[PDB]
Amino acid sequence: FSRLDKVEAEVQIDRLITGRLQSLQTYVTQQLIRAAEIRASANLAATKM
Amino acid sequence: ETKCTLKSFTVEKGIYQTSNFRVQPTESIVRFPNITNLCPFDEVFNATRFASVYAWNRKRISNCVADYSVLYNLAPFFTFKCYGVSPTKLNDLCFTN
Amino acid sequence: DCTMYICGDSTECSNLLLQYGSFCTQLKRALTGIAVEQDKNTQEVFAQV
């Protein structure tokens, strides 16, 4: 922001605010997966108990 | 705020979530090294003898205060295009060399 | 956090993030569904008495 004009500084920050916005959804997606077998082992654990 | 974030007028009993908590600043401090001089821009730009293209001369510029206003105001310019910086944002950054 | 991760300690960046729709208010809900379930996998195993 302190090196380029507001007319075309939005081109580059767009490429950066979309990279992180997708670098973060990937963490969520891998977290939904990881909570599916723990939910499938807290059901076997709640069965041997 | 809780009513205003659930899109309702009657919220149920329980712990909810709301916006964050960011401590705003108080004042502002700007610090620049020490130097109080004038850069030798009036020498290279206004020299009466420029080099040939194949034997160009490269000049150092160090330890001076650089003001590009007295430069960009030159009306008879035919081109002023900058790649990594913008021409109007050159009055707040300190360059290594 | 939506804005602190992407646009940490910046003001203009937090203004542009609103133009990108309601994307990350799903992140808060998605990461809360995981949060609550972790309190169900523990109350359904150990607390059967």
Curated annotation (Swiss-Prot), chain A:
It comes from the Viruses. Subunit of the fusion protein that is processed upon entry into the host cell. Mediates fusion of the virion and cellular membranes by functioning as a class I viral fusion protein. Contains a viral fusion peptide that is unmasked after S2 cleavage. This cleavage can occur at the cell membrane by host TMPRSS2 or during endocytosis by host CSTL. In either case, this triggers an extensive and irreversible conformational change that leads to fusion of the viral envelope with the cellular cytoplasmic membrane, releasing viral genomic RNA into the host cell cytoplasm. This is Spike protein S2'. The lineage of its organism: Viruses, Riboviria, Orthornavirae, Pisuviricota, Pisoniviricetes.
